[PDB]
């Protein structure tokens, strides 16, 4: 039996140390985001055959990361199908990136259904772009970020301390009732991971900024390193009364990131209308596509 | 300054050595609820100063429990109230038994406000009682398991075994459909922490049973040790089309619980006044109050 643990907090060392020299781009192996989402997943990993490997439930629907390492590919799959059959479930890999595809296909050809979804593919950008939004593409960012320093002039951008968390939280709240973000599918959920992660901010990794506005907290946004070369931002919210917030946070945070992270992952558009046009509007270098591969 | 980890299966011996031998008998101390429940209340623990200690978000509300262990009180509860104030809310601490209450109020008199809420107390009965249904206070429950015996005389009990797993599952996912857990808080909440523990079953430590009728389950149950003399009964589920399930469970069950635990803990009855009654029939020695409490300022 593969001695699958819960993921905890003091497993960051474990897991970067797959992660980080890994080509593995996708949001969902943030250590962040994986800690943080595990109460809703009761999610655990193992280390198999130099393999880091995750293990979700999602109610009926038992699911593995794609496994990150290198070495016998063929030996981990067999290991976990046998761990899916245990469980009485067919075996479903989700993260699985087109390189990806190919490794599955070439070890045991024909036997994958794969899956994709638009809604669930990453946007990735170039670092240099979003700090700098210089050139053409990035005309209209540049014009709303001069207009918000022209309309606050007196802003304050600081980084996110553990003594700044609670008011964020209690802000969030607030900001969410005025859009009646109850009443969104999956809201609920997504503030019991922004909770766990700003509870845990430190000991997680994370780092973030916090934007103010006449004495007022209006904006924060917090993320952590993905790989070795690629920054995710988690989370980045704003007080929708303040025209430009969110580009001007995204700026200041964006600069903030260690110049090692060429690029930066801002998640999923979730197949919403105008979140898939506001993360278009930064021109991604890469859309990072996520398959789902199911054993036929 | 509270190295404070999540709470994990890998725990189980940390956590047991400190609550076995402890004279606390309430079912949060359940390494199983510990971990079930911690999807809930994002729950972690930390040894300080040779005390056990756990620290829970209950929505908005921070908690701490009270101490595990034998020691200088005092000083481990300045640490605990340090890790409160770090956190930007007042200390408050859960699980105080009436006894553990007397013991703060003697090292810290009048510094703490202490709340109770009936609907949190754990029933707790005798082994004895439960599994031998002996005397006239219990003549309704043997009457229960007579007419079960008489109307499914080939029934079958199991003990939960790995292959009997799924069974369980499909049984609670029944269950739920009926109960309406998709909507329903505080049993979509329940099922959370049921499946938890029927997937981590062994890793747990976790014994439990199950009934068959007519070739199907009809009902099943599970638990664990709390002390080194009360044993937790965590989950307990039947078909409601069958009549006397949950009397002759109960019973087969608490037969399998080994003899040194001479008290079953049942649990809490929520406020609910059909499980109130429930609980109540089967003639608890014990409702183990459990107090909340608050720092009055600081
Ligand atoms: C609606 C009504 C039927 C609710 O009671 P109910 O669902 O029949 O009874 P309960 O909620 O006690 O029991 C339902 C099941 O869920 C269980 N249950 C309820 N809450 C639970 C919890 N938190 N955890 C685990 N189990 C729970 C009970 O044990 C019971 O299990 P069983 O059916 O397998 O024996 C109620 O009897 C009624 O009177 N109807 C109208 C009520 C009304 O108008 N209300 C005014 C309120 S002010």
Known sequence: MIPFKDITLADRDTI????????????????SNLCSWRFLYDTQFAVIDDFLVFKFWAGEQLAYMM????GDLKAVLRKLIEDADKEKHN???????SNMRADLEAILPERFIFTEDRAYADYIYLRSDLATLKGKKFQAKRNHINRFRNTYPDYEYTPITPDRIQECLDLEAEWC??????????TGNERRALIYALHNFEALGLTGGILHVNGKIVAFTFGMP?????FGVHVEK???????????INYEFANRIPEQYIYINREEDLGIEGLRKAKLSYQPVTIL????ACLK
């Open 67 to 70: 496994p990150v390492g290198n």
């Open 177 to 186: 009732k005025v859009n009646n973000c109850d009443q969104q599918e999956g």
């Open 238 to 248: 704003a007080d929708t009364s303040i025209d430009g917030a969110y580009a001007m």
């Open 16 to 31: 970067t140390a797959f992660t980080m020299k890994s080509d593995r781009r996708n949001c969902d192996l943030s250590f």
């Open 226 to 230: 993905i790989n070795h070369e690629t």
């Open 289 to 292: 596509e996520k398959y789902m």
């Open 91 to 97: 075996f479903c890999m989700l993260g699985v990136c």
